[PDB]
């Protein structure tokens, strides 16, 4: 019995560490990574995924919110102080006598109790603007100072609906993610194209066309090697550049014919042309093809040539020999925008580009990287919302009612199961338990407050984090998904039925 | 003495591990890994295959452990827990002042009733009714994930072990690792998976000129100067005018350059044990050389022959509508941990089937089969004359502890129900009043699936006694070589 | 806080002692005195009272049993078991953050609530024979070896019913408790008379006397002082017993004036005369008292006077210059007793002697003192039963009935004290759990059956020792006295409030 009393001591330790962290009104823990680089963040799965922890029994329960963050991205602080509460409570059951297996069918059968109970709270109504800022409020709250809650509300939701639309499956990759330095936190703000890092290097470029086609491409207009059964027949050093005229002249007549294309397809007035090679030019190149007005960018990722496709509609070209005007996209205002380190390119105004970019701006790394944590957490949240259009009430509302439901249920499927029910309705009190703590108001009172409120309909109160009253999280626009929930009744209570089963512990080679 | 006692504590502590590791409730450890990680399995053959002893007792352990493997992928938690319960009875051996040789003989003796004693408990099964069946596999399959496709299940484990036997031999010999070659092929999900009625080949495709679908195959089984008998050992095998030529040992680069201007599959690096499977699939023979092939290695009676990529991958199936003493399982998942668990838990259900095709015998598990022995013995033990009776009765009351765990797993007062367990042996007959896993009272095994084969309890007690003799045998430890 | 921690569990490895002594199928401690007393005895009060334990906490936890007992008589140990159980399901709460003045006022909440419970389900049967043997059997199961159960059973309860009648109150020193040894443990039974420790030793005496009337007497019949103005004064050894002669007739004249009152009062056959004077005795005076059919008993107690005049009715002498008729008192057979080694005087057949004699018989000192204690805590069990015309079931069912009313209960005054009603509650249901493993059943499951009892009706459920499923403890005979869970909840709160509210410890010298 001793043996299963250090995996219950362990588990209460980190409860006791990721108990602070939760809500906006709790704290912040900071990342020493040894190297010169320093994070802060209130995400679990970013305390315990990257952090390695001392005991070797927490660093198992590090890898539920590795799997948890795969599922749903977030939950994962409350589901470790479920966790911990569960074995606290049990602990007090085992020290009379009981068996733990005993205990987990208990579990076992408040799982289904709990889970049946979640269809009730669960609302079906339509998601709109309106609904879905009360959802992004909830959650950006907890990775920010509290000012940055109205700036990355409108940009998390509007990005959502941009990319979506007619029941389509909605993914993650559409939105890109890019940071800036040299501004404030407070101009978060959206890009209806993509935003490219390498820009063109030619005074000569325009700074700014209204309107101008895109032609994607992946040759390579530097001084290039040979191509056909040839090589350098020399006698000096003289005339090797001759035949470096050679190598080149297979490039130089390439980009003549770029002329064309443009002087073929709109090569009128109030008209422009931009170039989105992904491999180098050269500056004799790029001074041939500036005096035309033609923006040509180089050096770019891979990654925005995929995405450039899907923006502009461009075909990517592999040779400038079957140059044709099939393959050409199209861009609304192309610029590029003068920043105090950088410059970078802009191809904003497209019709369906379907893909936007979120440019997130801070002015250190650290607060720059938060940010990053709190779009990707609350963009999910956003797509469970709408992905399931059911959500649930949050402020503890579910765990309380749900609460209220095992302590009036009789046991359906043994006599002693019973005892696992009611400590697993003391655990999800835990929540409101802590909120209580963070926002400073008696732990207590919070609890008895929100309990004593029933009436003869729905009736569903939750924690007010400002004065501590018994406040309906529905009203007051407190919304959490469906599916977050659910994954807690099935991962707190399948991780704490492999804590409790362990009876001994064998060094293996330790 | 002292050499004595110390494969006592030796071997008790190694039962102390498992003992609560038995069961469908059974108990998960926690084994701390040397660079900080932690293993949560219950299985109790991974957990000791990885815990290093000191003691050369408990070692032995291991090494028996693994032989059971073997034979039956389940109950040899059994197996080391009655061993070391046998051995944990120490006041037989050193207080009493007892020789090792007198409780030899004692369990010796024991061993003789106990194997006539399950018997008399046993009953005929149906191989026939594939419901009747379904009840004794359905064992295994509960607790899994394959419980969603268990009727799949049993017909890919119980008709492959039907096409391994081979009963015009008298013997019935079953041989899993030479006729049921399980193979994986990527793409399509559990319900996708079947058994081919024939050979399946791993062998990828290597050059495109390859006959891809034929519905009638032939198999052949078998600078200057270099090339003559590469041209010559590859000339003599389009005489018979094949579609896949399926050599032994390793095809030279040269030799396939005729394989793909005839454009017939070229396959290599084959077992003997492969071949015959294939010449007694479509009536060909194995030939030692290319050069000396003659008109009966042909592929009459093969069902196709098809190289198709599947899930990314080739796979030459050359399956016929014949059972040639052999089988192939295919098995789909989506991914590598759905086809990790299918793979393995029928591996579990598949080695039942062997041992009730052997021996058509089942036995009431749950703990009815050991209060059904260890009630025979006691009562013999009254009416046995000589000094190995005290022994004797050691033995009725060690093998109480398998139904003891089980209750305690539970949680449920064990000595109220398994006292109260020995007056339903007692006094109504010994083959029903069980003891119930998942619930913990008592019931009766002809109503519930909890019969196991008799093959997996004779080699339980054989090898659990064994072990036991085995290790009171031993007296002194010599060191040196 | 931690001035608590050290107090709670304090107060549980008190619980894990004392709670293998509670019931019958409980287990024993023993006393070392140190000196060569060795005892045994489940009685909370015993082990805690005479016991030394060496934490100063549970000293205080101590006196309150002490208190305890002389209120009740019985129930000492499970009030410490609540005790424990309190602090253990405070401490849950206060690791939370929660101060212990709120959880105070949610015990005052449900102890009020409680002692409301216990109005309800109290049963007022009637006094009699049949329902108090049910009562006894369930005081003295728990002070002997499940042997003397139906032995001192009807001992008891026959006992209390000699001695209430006219609605007069009970009274515990009716009851005189003597002790014999040479003899088995079993022949404990009632004695109707008063039983007396040294009696008449001559072989001139009578066997038994059918009738007799006692005179009750205080004369000094040994060799006492000079009565007149004189002294002793002699020479030598022959002149002293000259002076024996002259003090002598300050005893030997007493003698005969005893006489002279046989033949007056009652002088002919069938009758007797039975001395009963407190001082020693001459054996002159024996011898001349002993042929007349006189018995003549010396070296008594000074209670025993006392119940002695109430036994026959006569009046206490001091002089037998002052003898008259009017102190003689009458009683029935007397006779001698004979043990193995001594012998005893037995008075028993009284006519209005309104005090019996428990006489117990064992063949230890050690064994004795058990029973010496169960018989106090036995009668003063159905001395409350009577004088509390209401009782209340046994078995632990008020426990589990509880629960069931204080779960269905909202504080009327605040919210936060509902978690100290949440306490109260899962600390009465310790003493099922206690039995539950005294009985060697498991301690949850006996738990669930008797809590899932329910029906539409009043149902009482308790917990079945032998078997472990709902008994009803009205059906089986087990009952306890109402004054006894009235002083549980009433005594258990008060000290659970005292503790909680302990700041800080200071050593104070
Ligand atoms: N002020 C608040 N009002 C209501 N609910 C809150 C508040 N603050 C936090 N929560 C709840 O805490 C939960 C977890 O939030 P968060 O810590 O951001 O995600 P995770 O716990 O998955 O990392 C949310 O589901 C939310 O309902
Ligand atoms: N449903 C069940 N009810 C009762 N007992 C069971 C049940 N299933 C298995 N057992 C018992 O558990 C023991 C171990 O079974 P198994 O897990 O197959 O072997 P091992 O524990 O060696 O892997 C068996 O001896 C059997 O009596
Ligand atoms: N055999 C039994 N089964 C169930 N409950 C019992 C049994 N014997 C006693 N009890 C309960 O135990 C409690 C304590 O009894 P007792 O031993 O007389 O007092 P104490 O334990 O304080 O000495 C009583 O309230 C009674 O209801």
């Given at each position: 019995?001793?043996?299963?009393?250090?995996?219950?001591?362990?588990?209460?330790?980190?409860?006791?560490?990721?108990?602070?962290?939760?809500?906006?009104?709790?704290?912040?823990?900071?990342?020493?990574?040894?190297?010169?680089?320093?994070?802060?963040?209130?995400?679990?799965?970013?305390?315990?995924?990257?952090?390695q922890?001392?005991?070797?029994?927490?660093?198992?329960?590090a890898?539920?919110?590795?799997?948890?963050?795969?599922?749903?991205?977030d939950?994962t602080?409350?589901?470790?102080?479920?966790?911990?509460?569960?074995?606290?409570?049990?602990?007090?059951?085992?020290?009379?006598?009981?068996?733990?297996?005993?205990?987990?069918?208990?579990?076992?059968?408040?799982?289904?109790?709990?889970?049946?109970?979640?269809?009730?709270?669960?609302?079906?109504?339509?998601?709109?603007?309106?609904?879905?800022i009360?959802?992004?409020?909830?959650?950006?709250?907890?990775?920010?100072?509290?000012?940055?809650?109205?700036?990355?509300?409108?940009?998390?939701?509007?990005?959502?609906?941009?990319?979506?639309?007619?029941?389509?499956?909605?993914?993650?990759?559409?939105?890109?993610?890019?940071?800036?330095?040299?501004?404030?936190?407070?101009?978060?703000?959206?890009?209806?194209?993509?935003?490219?890092?390498?820009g063109?290097?030619?005074?000569?470029?325009?700074?700014?066309?209204?309107?101008?086609?895109?032609?994607?491409?992946?040759?390579?207009?530097?001084?290039?090697?040979?191509?056909?059964?040839?090589?350098?027949?020399?006698?000096?050093?003289?005339?090797?550049?001759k035949?470096?005229?050679?190598?080149?002249?297979?490039?130089?007549?390439?980009?003549?014919?770029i002329?064309?294309?443009?002087?073929?397809?709109?090569?009128?007035?109030?008209?422009?042309?931009?170039?989105?090679?992904?491999?180098?030019?050269?500056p004799?190149?790029?001074?041939?093809?500036?005096?035309?007005?033609?923006?040509?960018?180089?050096?770019?990722k891979?990654?925005?040539?995929?995405?450039?496709?899907?923006?502009?509609?461009?075909?990517?070209?592999?040779?400038?020999?079957?140059?044709?005007?099939?393959?050409?996209?199209?861009?609304?205002?192309?610029?590029?925008?003068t920043?105090?380190?950088?410059?970078?390119?802009?191809?904003?105004?497209?019709?369906?580009?379907?893909?936007?970019?979120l440019?997130?701006?801070?002015?250190?790394?650290?607060?720059?990287?938060?940010?990053?944590?709190?779009?990707?957490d609350?963009?999910?949240?956003?797509?469970?919302?709408?992905?399931?259009?059911?959500?649930?009430?949050?402020?503890?509302?579910?765990?309380?009612?749900?609460?209220?439901?095992?302590?009036?249920?009789?046991?359906?499927?043994?006599?002693?199961?019973?005892?696992?029910v009611?400590?697993?309705?003391?655990?999800?009190?835990?929540?409101?338990?802590?909120?209580?703590?963070?926002?400073?108001?008696?732990?207590?009172?919070?609890?008895?407050?929100?309990?004593?409120?029933?009436?003869?309909?729905?009736?569903?109160?939750?924690?007010?984090?400002?004065?501590?009253?018994?406040?309906?999280?529905?009203?007051?626009?407190?919304?959490?998904?469906?599916?977050?929930?659910?994954?807690?009744?099935?991962?707190?209570?399948?991780?704490?039925?492999?804590?409790?089963?362990?009876?001994?512990?064998?060094?293996?080679?330790? | 003495?002292?050499?004595?006692?110390?494969?006592?504590?030796?071997?008790?502590?190694?039962?102390?591990?498992?003992?609560?590791?038995?069961?469908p409730?059974?108990?998960?450890?926690?084994?701390?890994?040397?660079?900080?990680?932690?293993?949560?399995?219950?299985?109790?053959?991974?957990?000791?295959?990885?815990?290093?002893?000191?003691?050369?007792?408990?070692?032995?352990?291991?090494?028996?452990?693994?032989?059971?493997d073997?034979?039956?992928?389940?109950?040899?938690?059994?197996?080391?827990?009655?061993?070391?319960?046998?051995?944990?009875?120490?006041?037989?051996?050193?207080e009493?002042?007892?020789?090792?040789?007198?409780?030899?003989?004692?369990?010796?003796?024991?061993?003789?009733?106990?194997?006539?004693?399950?018997?008399?408990?046993?009953?005929?099964?149906?191989?026939?009714?594939?419901?009747?069946?379904?009840?004794?596999?359905?064992?295994?399959?509960?607790?899994?994930?394959?419980?969603?496709?268990?009727?799949?299940?049993?017909?890919?484990?119980?008709?492959?072990?039907?096409?391994?036997?081979?009963?015009?031999?008298?013997?019935?010999?079953?041989?899993?690792?030479?006729?049921?070659?399980?193979?994986?092929?990527?793409?399509?999900?559990?319900e996708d998976?079947?058994?081919?009625?024939?050979?399946?080949?791993?062998?990828?495709?290597?050059?495109?000129?390859?006959?891809?679908?034929?519905?009638?195959?032939?198999?052949?089984?078998?600078?200057?100067?270099?090339?003559?008998?590469?041209?010559?050992?590859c000339?003599?095998?389009?005489?018979?005018?094949?579609?896949?030529?399926?050599?032994?040992?390793?095809?030279?680069?040269?030799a396939?350059?005729?394989?793909?201007?005839?454009?017939?599959?070229?396959?290599?690096?084959?077992?003997?044990?492969?071949?015959?499977?294939?010449?007694?699939?479509?009536?060909?023979?194995?030939?030692?050389?290319?050069?000396?092939?003659?008109?009966?290695?042909?592929?009459?009676?093969?069902?196709?022959?098809?190289?198709?990529?599947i899930?990314?991958?080739?796979?030459?199936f050359?399956?016929?509508?014949?059972?040639?003493?052999?089988?192939?399982?295919?098995?789909?998942?989506?991914?590598?941990?759905?086809?990790?668990?299918?793979?393995?838990?029928?591996?579990?259900?598949?080695?039942?089937?062997?041992?009730?095709?052997?021996?058509?015998?089942?036995?009431?598990?749950?703990?009815?089969?050991?209060?059904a022995?260890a009630?025979?013995?006691?009562?013999?033990?009254?009416?046995?004359?000589?000094?190995?009776?005290?022994?004797?009765?050691?033995?009725?009351?060690?093998?109480?502890?398998?139904?003891?765990?089980?209750?305690?797993?539970?949680?449920?007062?064990?000595?109220?129900?398994?006292?109260?367990?020995?007056?339903?042996?007692?006094?109504?007959?010994?083959?029903?009043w069980?003891?119930?896993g998942?619930?913990?009272?008592?019931?009766?095994?002809?109503?519930?699936?909890?019969?196991?084969?008799?093959?997996?309890?004779?080699?339980?007690?054989?090898?659990?006694?064994?072990?036991?003799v085995?290790?009171?045998?031993?007296?002194?430890?010599?060191?040196?070589?």
């Amino acid at each position: 019995q001793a043996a299963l009393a250090v995996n219950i001591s362990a588990a209460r330790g980190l409860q006791d560490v990721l108990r602070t962290n939760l809500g906006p009104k709790g704290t912040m823990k900071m990342l020493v990574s040894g190297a010169g680089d320093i994070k802060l963040t209130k995400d679990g799965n970013v305390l315990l995924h990257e952090m390695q922890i001392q005991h070797p029994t927490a660093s198992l329960i590090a890898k539920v919110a590795t799997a948890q963050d795969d599922i749903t991205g977030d939950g994962t602080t409350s589901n470790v102080l479920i966790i911990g509460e569960l074995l606290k409570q049990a602990d007090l059951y085992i020290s009379e006598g009981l068996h733990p297996r005993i205990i987990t069918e208990g579990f076992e059968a408040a799982k289904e109790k709990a889970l049946q109970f979640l269809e009730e709270v669960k609302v079906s109504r339509e998601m709109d603007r309106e609904t879905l800022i009360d959802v992004a409020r909830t959650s950006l709250r907890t990775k920010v100072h509290a000012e940055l809650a109205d700036v990355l509300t409108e940009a998390v939701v509007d990005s959502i609906l941009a990319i979506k639309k007619q029941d389509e499956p909605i993914d993650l990759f559409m939105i890109e993610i890019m940071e800036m330095k040299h501004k404030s936190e407070t101009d978060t703000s959206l890009i209806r194209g993509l935003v490219l890092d390498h820009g063109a290097r030619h005074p000569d470029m325009k700074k700014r066309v209204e309107d101008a086609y895109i032609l994607t491409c992946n040759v390579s207009l530097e001084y290039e090697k040979t191509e056909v059964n040839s090589g350098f027949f020399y006698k000096s050093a003289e005339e090797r550049e001759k035949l470096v005229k050679a190598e080149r002249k297979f490039i130089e007549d390439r980009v003549k014919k770029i002329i064309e294309l443009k002087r073929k397809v709109c090569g009128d007035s109030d008209k422009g042309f931009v170039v989105i090679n992904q491999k180098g030019i050269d500056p004799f190149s790029l001074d041939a093809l500036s005096k035309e007005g033609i923006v040509a960018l180089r050096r770019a990722k891979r990654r925005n040539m995929e995405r450039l496709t899907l923006a502009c509609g461009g075909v990517a070209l592999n040779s400038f020999d079957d140059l044709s005007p099939d393959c050409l996209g199209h861009a609304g205002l192309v610029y590029e925008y003068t920043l105090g380190e950088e410059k970078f390119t802009f191809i904003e105004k497209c019709n369906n580009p379907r893909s936007v970019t979120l440019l997130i701006k801070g002015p250190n790394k650290h607060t720059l990287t938060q940010i990053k944590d709190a779009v990707r957490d609350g963009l999910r949240a956003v797509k469970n919302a709408i992905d399931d259009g059911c959500v649930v009430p949050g402020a503890g509302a579910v765990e309380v009612a749900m609460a209220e439901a095992l302590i009036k249920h009789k046991p359906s499927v043994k006599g002693r199961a019973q005892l696992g029910v009611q400590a697993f309705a003391d655990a999800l009190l835990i929540i409101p338990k802590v909120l209580a703590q963070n926002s400073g108001f008696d732990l207590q009172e919070t609890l008895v407050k929100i309990q004593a409120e029933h009436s003869e309909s729905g009736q569903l109160v939750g924690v007010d984090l400002n004065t501590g009253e018994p406040m309906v999280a529905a009203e007051v626009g407190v919304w959490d998904n469906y599916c977050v929930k659910k994954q807690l009744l099935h991962s707190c209570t399948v991780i704490a039925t492999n804590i409790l089963l362990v009876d001994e512990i064998m060094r293996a080679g330790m | 003495r002292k050499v004595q006692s110390g494969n006592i504590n030796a071997a008790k502590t190694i039962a102390d591990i498992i003992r609560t590791c038995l069961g469908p409730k059974s108990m998960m450890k926690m084994l701390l890994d040397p660079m900080g990680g932690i293993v949560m399995t219950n299985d109790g053959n991974a957990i000791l295959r990885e815990i290093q002893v000191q003691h050369p007792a408990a070692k032995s352990m291991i090494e028996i452990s693994r032989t059971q493997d073997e034979e039956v992928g389940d109950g040899t938690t059994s197996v080391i827990i009655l061993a070391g319960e046998m051995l944990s009875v120490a006041e037989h051996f050193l207080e009493q002042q007892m020789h090792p040789t007198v409780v030899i003989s004692a369990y010796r003796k024991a061993l003789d009733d106990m194997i006539s004693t399950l018997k008399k408990i046993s009953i005929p099964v149906d191989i026939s009714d594939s419901d009747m069946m379904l009840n004794i596999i359905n064992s295994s399959i509960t607790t899994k994930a394959i419980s969603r496709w268990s009727s799949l299940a049993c017909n890919i484990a119980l008709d492959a072990v039907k096409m391994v036997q081979f009963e015009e031999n008298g013997r019935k010999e079953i041989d899993i690792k030479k006729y049921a070659r399980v193979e994986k092929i990527p793409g399509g999900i559990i319900e996708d998976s079947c058994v081919l009625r024939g050979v399946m080949i791993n062998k990828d495709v290597t050059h495109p000129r390859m006959r891809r679908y034929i519905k009638n195959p032939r198999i052949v089984l078998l600078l200057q100067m270099e090339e003559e008998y590469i041209q010559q050992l590859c000339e003599d095998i389009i005489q018979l005018k094949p579609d896949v030529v399926i050599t032994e040992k390793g095809i030279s680069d040269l030799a396939q350059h005729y394989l793909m201007r005839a454009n017939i599959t070229a396959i290599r690096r084959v077992r003997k044990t492969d071949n015959n499977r294939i010449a007694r699939a479509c009536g060909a023979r194995i030939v030692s050389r290319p050069e000396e092939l003659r008109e009966d290695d042909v592929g009459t009676g093969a069902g196709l022959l098809e190289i198709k990529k599947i899930g990314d991958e080739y796979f030459t199936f050359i399956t016929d509508c014949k059972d040639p003493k052999a089988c192939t399982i295919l098995l789909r998942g989506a991914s590598k941990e759905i086809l990790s668990e299918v793979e393995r838990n029928l591996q579990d259900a598949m080695q039942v089937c062997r041992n009730v095709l052997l021996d058509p015998q089942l036995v009431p598990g749950g703990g009815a089969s050991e209060m059904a022995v260890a009630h025979a013995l006691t009562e013999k033990s009254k009416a046995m004359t000589g000094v190995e009776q005290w022994p004797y009765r050691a033995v009725a009351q060690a093998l109480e502890v398998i139904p003891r765990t089980l209750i305690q797993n539970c949680g449920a007062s064990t000595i109220r129900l398994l006292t109260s367990l020995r007056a339903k042996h007692t006094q109504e007959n010994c083959e029903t009043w069980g003891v119930n896993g998942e619930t913990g009272t008592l019931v009766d095994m002809k109503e519930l699936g909890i019969w196991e084969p008799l093959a997996v309890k004779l080699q339980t007690y054989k090898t659990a006694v064994e072990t036991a003799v085995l290790l009171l045998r031993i007296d002194d430890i010599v060191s040196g070589h």
